[PDB]
Each structure stands twice: as structure tokens, then as C-alpha cells.
Nucleic acid binder design. Structure first.
Lengths: 96, 25, 214, 91, 127, 94, 194
RNA sequence: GGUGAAAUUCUUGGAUUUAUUGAAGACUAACUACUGCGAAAGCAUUUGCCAAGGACGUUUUCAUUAAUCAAGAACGAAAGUUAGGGGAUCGAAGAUGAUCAGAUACCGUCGUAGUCUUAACCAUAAACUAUGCCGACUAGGGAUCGGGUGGUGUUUUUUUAAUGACCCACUCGGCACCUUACGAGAAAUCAAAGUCUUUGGGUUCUGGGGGGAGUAUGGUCGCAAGGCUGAAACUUAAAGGAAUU
């Protein structure tokens, strides 16, 4: 499931929450995979996808809202997009 | 000694007695 | 009272090339007068024939096909696939108590824009040397078997258009590889196919439908 | 402190207008005064303006719907049947 | 060189139906039925009435040289009785004796998946 | 009072109730566990089959039966002469 | 004066440099900034204007045109729509389910917006005060308050007059009755509790 | 069209039926069993998602954290109530046609509320296994659900590697059965309803003749319908349970 891997990443690997941390992370080049919610504004996720494919970064689509994304990652607030710099003890980069 | 119909008649008597009580109070 | 027979004519129908037999009966049709034009009223019609009649053998007795007419040409109207069904008098035979019934359904497309509703039926067999009484299913093998049978039939229909789907449905090789590829789940006897329902159609598509009678 | 035990929202009407009238408008006022979330942000900020108006102060999106509920069961069933028909034609 | 048809025998209760028609089903012939040859309100399903109905159907079948006809016997269906009427056997035997070719029998009574709750209520009919 | 178990219901679940078929004594059966009397009566009764075999345009084939799973005999089949009233030798079978 | 909202959609002129501001009946489930697809070759989505001749049976459509070119006749009140039963390829017509439960057959070239008009179930909350009714009817016409004809004067109404109060004659009025006598029930086939 | 027999009703404007469909609602038939889950009510299509639960195996952990329940909270069949959606079949009321001395009952046809769902009430049943929960022992056998163990077990192929289907022997947890009664019971019967005069394992609740009466009143919850607690006056020598002719 997505939630267990997300929790394993949030416990071991580094992470940036929000928009601008994510954009600086990817733009510098450390980001390996980004997570975009379903209720994200089209233009927003479209640009994210453009940045990822120009920077050669994998893209995964999450069906749900920002609040459930926050609950899954382990933070009670809401998050529109997240990126993983290194998996750590996880293997989400290999599979999926 | 039909329990159901005598029981229903008992509730009708309850209705009438409640109406009589509500007439004064 | 007028005589309907003198006001009506006879018509002959030929089965598609999917079945080697051609003639599938004789349909009574009113004369196509200019006021009514009964010729175009024949487009929306179906004809139900037995597979045993359409094959000349006796192992197709419990199989039959309804055959929708597509084009009419000088008392020689030709027909096309509409949908087959297992006869209910026979369909109540192989189903018995003290055994498990298996039913799977799909909405898989084909190569000619047709959409079909394919179902299938599988049982559990009282194996040889058995001493038990019912040989019931574990209830989770059905969960494990439903996915594979749907997968194997969907991959078979995909990549093959309607013509060879029928040309291989009549021999009933579909249940041939079901048992051997699933010998590790249940004995799986009586894997005869079930109804196929065709929901949405493309346009008339003149010419290509002639090839089934060309 | 919960000054009113059962009257709730409709305490301004006082003693008159009866009981059924006040209780019905009360049930309607709970749902029509409730805070909703825009389907595009997720924050509880949607508020009712005019009749059939579901405005917001943060998402800045107005979604037309019921005069007192942003999405009724009729909306759910009509969306379901319309998407069924759309799938059937587009299949 | 024989011409076929569909007789679609409808064996119901208190009435019997025979309808010889082409395989297409959009054109039918000989609407004669069990009640055609009797006026009793209680002998419609009797074997004699069914035999007379089939004899009339067979006689009218060969108007312009119709040889054979398929049959498909059905009951009332729905959720009422789910069994063929007594006159069904007499109906299908009369025309067969009359020289009419019979074959490809098929039990076309409709059966539901426990739907459309039938007439009677919880306690049903009582006599 | 007789009828310890009454019917075969020892577990729970209550099942459901199906309509009774052509009895004129239809009612809510005590669960699906009643007298069944499944019938495999043929579409054609005995005799008169020689006429059908000869009149068949094609040879052999045919001869199926009616496959009717019945649940119509419940607490009123004594009128219909199906279930026989018995005595303390009822220990046979269930 | 309308419980249902108004959808203001701006179109693009395909003939000259201009953008047309259209006033549409606001359906439910449609939000500002979403693209309205007005035409025949569009897809079955809420807010689309697909004609009933290019849609299958059973679809829910609001703001149904009676005839082509009328530009809005049927299904204009909040919480109402139209259901399609069937269509005939010959002499193109569409069978519709009228919001009154009536039967009407119209041409297949009639446009309608897919969905249900917003503001459904508007008449669920009573008006309580006379002020709510007064404000409701101030925006429509001078039809409030309405006086009973039984507390009237003999000259003022046929139903009035008398020391006591009573209707006097039968309240049902024939369809062929002249103007002036049509006071009460008009062509009432049946009356009483339904 | 129907009933034992009839009748209402629909039928040249085509009744009923058939063939092509389309739309609406409800259910999950056959598979359905002295076969299975849930505390109870209750659960009988496909697939995905979420969490929870019993049993099994453990040479892993805590350490007696444990059993029953006044007052006290949650679920809770059908029916009923509030406001929407839906409203196809059936259908409390009702409208009709019978039979009947009488029939607003049984019988045929329509038919509102209701039968389905949503948010909130209703807290009731032959809600029965009429048998409370926890723990221990006691004559046997067979079948069955889930798990596990051993036997080159018989099968499945690419005989054979495996899996899974079953065979044999056994185990735990069960729902439960068949023959007998050491024992109990007034008997019907019970592997407990046994281990109660040879009377005592722990715990909660209920009843002291039948009516009055689950009634009066007083409290309490409920929109209402209703639910919980709950008498007295007066009357009778019989009410009631198992089997026999």
C-alpha cells in the first residue's frame, strides 16, 4: 500500500513539504519522485509534470485530497505536493 | 381470552382515560 | 376478412461463413408495397437456430445461436452475430446441490469495436478414489480462480476480431485450456461457456458484412 | 453552557409559530449554516450567499447547488446515471 | 425441402395458447386458442379444448403449404405458478397426430432471481 | 410437545423467505428449510412418445425433462398429499 | 424573483472579433471556470448543450427547448428536469418526461443543458412570517395578499354576500363559462382529498 | 383475465401473446446443505479500498493485569414518526365483484401510507436453544467447518521439481448429531436440564395461587405513537404442567 511506504519514508528518508521547497528541491536535482494529489489545480500539477520530465524525475498520481495526503504522510495538516530526496530504508524508487 | 385484542382494547381505554384526564388538566 | 397469405411472401436466410451450413430456415414477410415499404422493416429482426442444426452433429444440441439479419437481397437475406445462450432446459442439468458453482463476468472489448458480455461456468468434481460426500470449495479458490479465467479469456479475445472468435467458439476449444492451466486449483469439470451479449454496434458497414456470405 | 436544550438555533422565534414549524426550520438551518469545503482545495471555508449560492473566501470558487445543501442525494444519483450513460456511449 | 416455424405453446392455468409463427417472430398465423372451441369458463385448460385448438391450428397451418413448425412450451412464468398447465401435453399431442412435424422442443417459461414479490401477501391465499 | 428441533435450524441467520409456488396456501415458510420435493418430471408424459419420435424431421435427438426445484410443500401439503403424518418412528432420516 | 441561480457564460464569436455574454440557467454541479461544451459532437457532461437527438435514452436533461429556435421553453424551475424515454429515427422526435409527469413528443433538434437545475428542494422550508412572503412576492407582481371570495361583497364577487358566510352555489366552474364566472374551481373533473 | 364454481376489469381505437429493444424500482434465485460469520438483531452477485474479529502455530513478551454485574452506555428484527430522493411489484385503510340469513372476513381486480435509501427518533417480538455468564470432571461412535502434524500416500503437469485436489491416523476451537442412562427430572427429556438431603465452585437478574393488572397514581425518556418503574381495593378455590384409557 502507499501509506506504509510513505510512513517508512517519513521515518527514515529526508523530505520537503509544500510547494516551494518541492520546486527548489527538484530544480536543484536531489528529488527522485514527487507525489501529487488529485485535487491539485490542473495547471499546478501540469507544471510539476513539466518540471519533472525536463529534470528527468518520476511522477506518480495520488487519488485523493490534501488532508488525506497529510494523514497518510503522518502530518495532521494538509499538503498539496511532496517529494522524496532519498528513500533511505524504503524501495519506492525501485518498484511502482 | 384473546391477549392481542383485549390488549388493544386496554390501550383504547388508556386513550379514553388520558382524554378524560386532559379535559381537566 | 382478407387473406394474409396472399398479401405476404416468403424469404430465405443464409448463415454467415462462421458456420459451414448456410440455410437457417424460411421467414414469412409481407409484400414491400410503396405505401408501407416492408423491405426496410426486416433490418430489425433476429432468427434463433440450434447449433446442432447449424453443425450437423449431436454434441451441439445444448447450444444454439440467435442470428440477427443485417442485409436483405432478393429473398436471400444474410445475417450476423447477435448473441448465443445456453438452453434453460439443459442449463438446469449440470447444476446440482453438494457442489460449488463458479461464475465470472467481463466487459472486454474486441478488435472490431464490438462489445461483448462473456460469462463462464465452472464446477468442482468428485474426484476418483473419493470417500467424502460433498467436496465443497474452500471459498477462496473461487477468488483465486475468478481472476485467472477472466484474464485468460480477455487476452484471448483481445487481438482477435469477431470472425475467428466465432470460428473458435463453435469447436469450444475455450474450455480446453482452462482445465489444464488451472489443474492446480480444482479438478474443474464442466467449463462450458455462458451467454455473450452484444450491447453497442458500429454503423451498418456495407461490404465487410458481405464477406461472411461472399 | 447550552442555554437551550432542544430549541437550538431557532430560539429567536420565541414561543409562537408552533413546534413543527420551528423544528423544521431548525433542521434546515443546521445544514444551511454548516461550513463546507471546496472540492478543489479541501479547506472548510464554503459559505452560503444567495439562494443556490455556495461561495468561498479562500478557494474563490462558487459551485451552484441546492438552496440549503451543496450536494443532495438527487445530485449523487443524477451524477451516477449521467456518468453511466457517458461511459456507455464512450465505450 | 421443408419449411419450419415456431408454435410457442403457452400452457397456462384456466387457459391454453397456441401460436404458430415464423422463426422471425414478427409475423404470426392461426391465433386460435383453447377457448376458441368451447364456452364454459372452466374447460379452457381441459385436454379436449387443447386438442380442438391444435387441430384448428394444424388445419390452418397448411394454407399455402407449410410443412413443419418448431415448438417452445412455456408456463405462465413470472412468480405465479412456475409449472406448465394440464392442457399443454394435450395441445402438443393433437397436431402431432394430425401429421404435423414436431421437433426442437424447448422450455421457455421465464424464471426470476427471487424478485417481483407475487400476489397474496405474507399469509397468502386461504381457503 | 413433540418436534424438538421443529426444522433443521440450529445455527442463526434467519435466512430469507421465498414465495410458495402454486399452492393456494402460500405463507412465510420458517426459513428456506422446509419440505422440498424437487421434481424432474419430463416435458412429455409417458406414452405418445412414439408419435413424437416418428414426427421428428431429424432422427434421434431431443427427450429432455422439466427441471423444477420446488419449495411449495410447507405445512399444507397434507391437503396436496405430499407429506405424510407419522408417529414416533419419525427418527428415520432427520 | 427566481430561486434557481443564473449562469453567465461568455462565448466566442466564430464570425467576427467579439465575445458573446450568454445568460444560462444555472445547473447544479457546475462551477465557474469549467468549460461549457455547447454543440452536438460534445460529450455527455453536466452543463453541456447536447441536443436530445444525439443522446441515448434515460439521460437527465434540463432547460429543454420545445421547438428548435425557441431558446428555452421547458425545465426552467429549480430542482426540475426532463427524462428521455425513447426516440424514433424516422420523422425525428424525442420522447420526454415533463416535470408535471405529463407526456410530450418534440423534435430531435431541440437543445438542452445536461443535468439538474441548482437550488433543488427550494420549497422545503416554510415562510413563517408574512414578511418572508411579502418580500418573496414583491419581486414578482402584486399578487399578495389574496382575499377570500366568501368574505366578500355581493357586487365584488359572486362568492360573497349574505349575513352568514357561504359559497352559495357549486364552486366548480365549467370550462365554457364566460369571463367573470370563473371564480373557484375551473373544469374540476373531481374534487376532495386525493 | 382469474376462482372449487363465478364475477369486476381489458377487448375493431387490436385485448392476451410473440420478435426487436429501451426506461424505472426491488432482490441476489438455481449453487442452498442437522455446510459457514457476527455480542445480538442480523449476513446468501462481481471487483477495488478501509479497518476490525475468531481459530491455528510460537522454545516471543507482560505479569495476575482476573470472572460476574447495582447505578450506569452502545447495538438492536418488523412495524411507526419527521423532512427529502425514488415510488417498478406487493400492499394496513379504502373502492368494487362474489359466497353467505347476515360478511366493510376468508376468495378475484384496482388502490394511498408503507415496502428501498438518506440525516435524526422510536429501545419494542415466540428478540426461543422459552435453558445467564466463567471455570473443572464424567459411557462411546461417526460425519462436518477452520488450522496444524506424520505417513516416498493416491493425484496435477514439464511421469518426477512444487502448489493445490483429495486418502489414512491424530490434535485444538466450534456449530452440532447417533445408541444408552452411571445421574437428574412429575414426565415430556437431558452428555446436561448430571456432579442438589450424601444439600455449599464464583457471580448477576427474576417469582410466591389465579384474576384484578402490567392496571391506578407518582416519576422518567420520547415530535407523537409509546418505553422503564410500578400498586391497591375487591373476587374465587381452584387456575396451570407431563402422560393414560
Amino acid at each position: 500500500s502507499i501509506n506504509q511506504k510513505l510512513a517508512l519514508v517519513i521515518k527514515s528518508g529526508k523530505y520537503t513539504l509544500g510547494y516551494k521547497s518541492t520546486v527548489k528541491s527538484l530544480r536543484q536535482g536531489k528529488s527522485k519522485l514527487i507525489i501529487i494529489a488529485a485535487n491539485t489545480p490542473v495547471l499546478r500539477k501540469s507544471e510539476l509534470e513539466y518540471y519533472a520530465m525536463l529534470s528527468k524525475t518520476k511522477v506518480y498520481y495520488f487519488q485523493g485530497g490534501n488532508n488525506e495526503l497529510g494523514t497518510a504522510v503522518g502530518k495532521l495538516f494538509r499538503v498539496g505536493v511532496v517529494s522524496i530526496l532519498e528513500a533511505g530504508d524504503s524501495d519506492i524508487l525501485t518498484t511502482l | 381470552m384473546r391477549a392481542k385484542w383485549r390488549k388493544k382494547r386496554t390501550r383504547r381505554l388508556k386513550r379514553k382515560r388520558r382524554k378524560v384526564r386532559a379535559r381537566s388538566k | 376478412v382478407v387473406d394474409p397469405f396472399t398479401r405476404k411472401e416468403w424469404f430465405d436466410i443464409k448463415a454467415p461463413s462462421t458456420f459451414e451450413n448456410r440455410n437457417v430456415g424460411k421467414t414469412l414477410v409481407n409484400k414491400s408495397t410503396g405505401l408501407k415499404s416492408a423491405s426496410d422493416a426486416l433490418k430489425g429482426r433476429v432468427v434463433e437456430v440450434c447449433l446442432a442444426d447449424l453443425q450437423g452433429s449431436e454434441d451441439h444440441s445444448f447450444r444454439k445461436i440467435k442470428l440477427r439479419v443485417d442485409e436483405v437481397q432478393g429473398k436471400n437475406l444474410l445475417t450476423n452475430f447477435h448473441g448465443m445462450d445456453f438452453t434453460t432446459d439443459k442449463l438446469r442439468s449440470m447444476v446440482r446441490k453438494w457442489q460449488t458453482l463458479i461464475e465470472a463476468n467481463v466487459t472486454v472489448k474486441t478488435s472490431d469495436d464490438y462489445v461483448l458480455r462473456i460469462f463462464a461456468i465452472a464446477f468442482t468434481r468428485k474426484q476418483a478414489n473419493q470417500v467424502k460426500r460433498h467436496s465443497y470449495a474452500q471459498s477462496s479458490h473461487i477468488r483465486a480462480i475468478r481472476k485467472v479465467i477472466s484474464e485468460i479469456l480477455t487476452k484471448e479475445v483481445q487481438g482477435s476480431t469477431l470472425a475467428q472468435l466465432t470460428s473458435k467458439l463453435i469447436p469450444e476449444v475455450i474450455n480446453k485450456e482452462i482445465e489444464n492451466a488451472t489443474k492446480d486449483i480444482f479438478p474443474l469439470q464442466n467449463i462450458h461457456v455462458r451467454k455473450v451479449k452484444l450491447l453497442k454496434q458500429p454503423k451498418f458497414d456495407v461490404g465487410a458484412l458481405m464477406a461472411l456470405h461472399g | 453552557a447550552k442555554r437551550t436544550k432542544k430549541v437550538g438555533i431557532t430560539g429567536k422565534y420565541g414561543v409562537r409559530y408552533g413546534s413543527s414549524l420551528r423544528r423544521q426550520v431548525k433542521k434546515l438551518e443546521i445544514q444551511q449554516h454548516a461550513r463546507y469545503d471546496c472540492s478543489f482545495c479541501g479547506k472548510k471555508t464554503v459559505k452560503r450567499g444567495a439562494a443556490g449560492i455556495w461561495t468561498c473566501s479562500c478557494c474563490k470558487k462558487t459551485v451552484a447547488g441546492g438552496a440549503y445543501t451543496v450536494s443532495t442525494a438527487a445530485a449523487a444519483t443524477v451524477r451516477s446515471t449521467i456518468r453511466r450513460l457517458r461511459e456507455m456511449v464512450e465505450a | 425441402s421443408q419449411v419450419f416455424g415456431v408454435a410457442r405453446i403457452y400452457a397456462s392455468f384456466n387457459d391454453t395458447f397456441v401460436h404458430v409463427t415464423d422463426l422471425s417472430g414478427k409475423e404470426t398465423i392461426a391465433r386460435v386458442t383453447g377457448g376458441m372451441k368451447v364456452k364454459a369458463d372452466r374447460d379452457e385448460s381441459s385436454p379436449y379444448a387443447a386438442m380442438l385448438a391444435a387441430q384448428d391450428v394444424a388445419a390452418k397451418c397448411k394454407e399455402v403449404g407449410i410443412t413443419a413448425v418448431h415448438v417452445k412450451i412455456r408456463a405462465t412464468g413470472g412468480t405465479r405458478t412456475k409449472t406448465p398447465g394440464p392442457g399443454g401435453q394435450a395441445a402438443l399431442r393433437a397436431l402431432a397426430r394430425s401429421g404435423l412435424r414436431i421437433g426442437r422442443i424447448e422450455d421457455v417459461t421465464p424464471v426470476p432471481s427471487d424478485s417481483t414479490r407475487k400476489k397474496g401477501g405474507r399469509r397468502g391465499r386461504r381457503l | 410437545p413433540k418436534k424438538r428441533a421443529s426444522n433443521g435450524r440450529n445455527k442463526k441467520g434467519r435466512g430469507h423467505v421465498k414465495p410458495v409456488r402454486c399452492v393456494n396456501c402460500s405463507k412465510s415458510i420458517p426459513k428456506d428449510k422446509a419440505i422440498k420435493r424437487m421434481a424432474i418430471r419430463n416435458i412429455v408424459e409417458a406414452a405418445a412418445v412414439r408419435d413424437l419420435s416418428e414426427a421428428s424431421v431429424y432422427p434421434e435427438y431431443a427427450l429432455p425433462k422439466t427441471y423444477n426445484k420446488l419449495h411449495y410443500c410447507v405445512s399444507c401439503a397434507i391437503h396436496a398429499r405430499i407429506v405424510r403424518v407419522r408417529s414416533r418412528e419419525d427418527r428415520k432420516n432427520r | 424573483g427566481r430561486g434557481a441561480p443564473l449562469a453567465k457564460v461568455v462565448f466566442r464569436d466564430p464570425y467576427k472579433y467579439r465575445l458573446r455574454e450568454e445568460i444560462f440557467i444555472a445547473n447544479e454541479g457546475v462551477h465557474t471556470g469549467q468549460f461549457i461544451y455547447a454543440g452536438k459532437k460534445a460529450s455527455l457532461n453536466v452543463g453541456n448543450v447536447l441536443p436530445l437527438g444525439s443522446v441515448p435514452e434515460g439521460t437527465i436533461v434540463s432547460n429543454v427547448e420545445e421547438k428548435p429556435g425557441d431558446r428555452g421553453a421547458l425545465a426552467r424551475a429549480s430542482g426540475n428536469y426532463v427524462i428521455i424515454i425513447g426516440h424514433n429515427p424516422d420523422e425525428n422526435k424525442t420522447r420526454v418526461r415533463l416535470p408535471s409527469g405529463a407526456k410530450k413528443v418534440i423534435s430531435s433538434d431541440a437543445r438542452g443543458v445536461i443535468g439538474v437545475i441548482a437550488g433543488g428542494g427550494r420549497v422545503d422550508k416554510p415562510l413563517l412570517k408574512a414578511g418572508r412572503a411579502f418580500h418573496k412576492y414583491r419581486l414578482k407582481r402584486n399578487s399578495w395578499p389574496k382575499t377570500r371570495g366568501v368574505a366578500m361583497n355581493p357586487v365584488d364577487h359572486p362568492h360573497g354576500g349574505g349575513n352568514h358566510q357561504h359559497i352559495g352555489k357549486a364552486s366548480t366552474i365549467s370550462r365554457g363559462a364566460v369571463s367573470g364566472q370563473k371564480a373557484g374551481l375551473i373544469a374540476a373533473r373531481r374534487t376532495g382529498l386525493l
